[PDB]
Amino acid sequence: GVQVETISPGDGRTFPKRGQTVVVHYTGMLEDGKKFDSSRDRNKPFKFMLGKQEVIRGWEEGVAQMSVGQRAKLTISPDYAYGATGHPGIIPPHATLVFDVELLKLE
């Protein structure tokens, strides 16, 4: 599944809803601690819309429980991410993913 551990609190009241655009910065790492991808490296916040099947399940479920402003660590099992195949070249097979996610804005 996905575990959400708060790093720093959000507003405690404004949570993502279907149809809203979620704006984040994230860093993704393997259990080894090695980074596989970061929006901060690209100088560009990552945006997705909730309920449009745009992201892995662990994101859909994990970010939905964050409030605006919150920074959290999401630990995501392979079955809530890229599963047995992974994504060759980027995400290894059967990988547990750990993301540092900061919910910057809802728009």
Residues near ligand UQI (CB under 6 A) are 26, 28, 37, 46, 55-56, 59, 87, 90-91
Instruction: Assess whether 26 carries a catalytic annotation.
Output: yes
Q: Three-state SS string across 59-99, please?
A: HHHHHCCCCCCCEEEEEECHHHCCCCCCECCCECCCCCEEE
Q: Which of 42, 52, 38, 47 is nearest to 105 (CA)?
A: 47
Choose between 49 and 55: whose C-beta lies nearer to ligand UQI: 55
Could you confirm whether 99 is annotated as catalytic?
Answer: yes
What is d(CA 51, CA 26) in angstroms, rounded to the nearest whole number?
19
Catalytic annotation present for 80: no
CB of 36 to ligand UQI, least distance (A): 7
Residue nearest to ligand UQI (CB): 87
Residues catalogued as catalytic: 26, 36-37, 56, 82, 99
